[PDB]
Design a protein around this ligand. Structure first.
Ligand SMILES: [K+]
Ligand SMILES: [K+]
Lengths: 383, 383
């Protein structure tokens, strides 16, 4: 990124080092990129990338027989550099992903197969997800939205560094209704104590998904406050994570929530599907059910939707009838100031202070007129 | 009902008796109707009819003060024949139905009050229903539709005489998924045994709603098969009840299901409302979710909707494109014969063999043309 084309004569790069790390710095300047691996490499005859690859072609209906499988193996990048394929096919058979009809040896997708493909889910993750859902449908808590959120809470990657001492403090202060959900999932208070007392991550044993469970329940709490319209600064102080890690999490959970919804629909689990089908939109914007209609407008996010709701505008229909200058004023009240704000400067009438995507700078007035204009266009398309 | 006006010269009535019951028969011929009671009569200072009456006028907003209450007491039929009112007002206060603001002594409705009124529910029944729902939301089974049905299964009157021996036979053969729902509700196997072994109805103690629970769970099983499109004859043989008692039950449960849905909506219980809001339509016709669209047509019931679904017509949209004579044929296949049916009689082309409400006799042809005609009119109103 050193050197602007058409602007600079040269691009300069400086790597600051010490005498001790002097040799490692030179290694980088002379270093070159490593050769590209296939990521489908084989004491592991089976592998995730291959299992998914084989599942996609069989369920999709472009690979039926055993001859089609090895023909596919020829097209891979792994074979370009110049058994394992057969192992993945059996794996799909053992775990009810694929069917075999002896037309000798022809493979067809199951309901679980077609569901996994439509859900864009990884076959390795689908097994635990399928069990987790069946476990939840045997005993489910409906008095709050926490248990539902847990099912759509992603835990395939760490989104933040969790302070366990902070976690235990929230555990005790946690209401009884949410402790019931914790117990029902696997959250044991004993494991939480062995985390604060001693910084033993363990996780060496495969059976230590016990760690992931507590990380997942911690995350669901964050997502619970998030769709409860709890301020980002409160969530930051309460949990110990920045706004960057949160936004990356909600956009991840919004997508994941859609996956579990599709997965539940293709298996015929209507009751479970019915509950989940409202959280994709709520996780995206971080809102409650009431603001779901307002946030259809492009410029209206969580903060702008709430202040317009609390001012009499509950729906797009109510927002189309709106007086523009009234919308503008309500927007002006949602701004965050360090001092308890909420002189006359008439030189700020042209200040473009509202950002969009692929944006021209919008004034607070122009944005308001756009919100009312868009609301009317949507109101007509609703008929 | 003896004597047709404009037809008969006299109407004759004969009461057949023996010598032993001779005196009781004469008592009827000379007998006259008893005076009409008020049904709001008072060791019972409080009474159901009064509590409901007082609740309706306060929540509705036509009675606020204490003066309005006794003014209402004057308009009653009980006072027409010429304390207790004050007792009912306190009862509504004790059970969170009504609020009191000391403008000395002014009464307003609570959320629980406004919910009960909108639900058309009796205040006496609302207390147990409110507890039952809160109990269900703490631990709910979603793998089947049984637990949801239990919440909308009415038990304020007996709809049939339950054979307990038959019940215990269905209990053992009952799958594990439905035994979990039974335990979760209150169905104890010990009580079922003390019913078959000994015909002890008990029910003298008020705390013996334990009887109602088992009667309610028995009923939910019937409703489960009913919306699973299990034949009426199978349900008759399996449970021991006639088709008359069943139809009276489903139309009762369809109405009740709507009540619990409204009740849940006014309390803000969205998750619970979401699950219940699909069973009013299914209980009415006795169908599965797939036939919900077809049964919008007036002439299409459960039986006609299924045979049209299994023949390629899944929606009203598919049914508007239908060839009339094809619909007619599919209908002809749904008819029940004692022999394994499903000569050429062309004299039955005018036989009106299909009944409607406020009906002219419809031929199987005319009905088919009406179904396709109605489907098209509905398809246009859907846009
Ligand atoms: K938006
Ligand atoms: K109908």
């Amino acid at each position: 990124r050193a050197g602007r084309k058409g602007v600079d004569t040269v691009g300069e790069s400086i790597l600051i080092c010490k005498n001790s790390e002097k040799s490692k710095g030179i290694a980088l300047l002379q270093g070159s990129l490593k050769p590209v691996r296939s990521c489908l490499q084989r004491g592991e005859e089976v592998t995730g990338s291959m299992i998914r690859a084989i599942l996609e072609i069989i369920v999709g209906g472009v690979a039926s027989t055993s001859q089609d499988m090895h023909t596919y193996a020829a097209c891979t990048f792994l074979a370009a550099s110049m058994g394992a394929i057969e192992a993945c096919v059996m794996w799909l058979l053992e775990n009810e992903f694929i069917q075999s009809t002896e037309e000798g040896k022809v493979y067809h997708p199951t309901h679980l197969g077609s569901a996994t493909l439509s859900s864009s889910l990884s076959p390795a993750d689908t097994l635990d997800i399928f069990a987790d859902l069946q476990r939840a449908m045997k005993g489910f808590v409906l008095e709050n939205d926490l248990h539902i959120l847990y099912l759509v809470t992603p835990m395939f990657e760490d989104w933040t560094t969790i302070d366990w001492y902070r976690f235990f403090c929230l555990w005790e202060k946690l209401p009884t209704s949410m402790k019931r959900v914790a117990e029902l999932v696997g959250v044991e208070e004993g494991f939480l104590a062995r985390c604060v007392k001693g910084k033993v991550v363990a996780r060496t044993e495969r059976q230590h998904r016990q760690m992931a469970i507590h990380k997942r329940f911690f995350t669901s709490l964050v997502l619970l406050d998030l769709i409860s319209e709890v301020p980002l600064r409160e969530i930051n102080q309460k949990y110990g994570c920045n706004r960057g890690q949160i936004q990356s999490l909600q956009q991840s959970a919004a997508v994941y929530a859609g996956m579990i919804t599709v997965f539940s629909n293709r298996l015929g689990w209507h009751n479970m599907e019915l509950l989940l089908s409202q959280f994709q939109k709520r996780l995206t914007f971080g809102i409650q059910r009431e603001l779901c209609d307002l946030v259809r407008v492009s410029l209206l996010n969580a903060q702008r939707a709430r202040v317009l709701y609390a001012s009499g505008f509950h729906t797009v229909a109510d927002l189309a009838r709106a007086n523009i200058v009234e919308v503008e004023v309500i927007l002006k009240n949602a701004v965050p100031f360090k001092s308890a704000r909420k002189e006359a400067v008439e030189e700020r009438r042209n200040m473009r202070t509202i950002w969009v995507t692929g944006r021209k700078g919008l004034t607070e007035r122009e944005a308001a007129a756009l919100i009312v204009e868009e609301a009317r266009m949507i109101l007509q398309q609703d008929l």
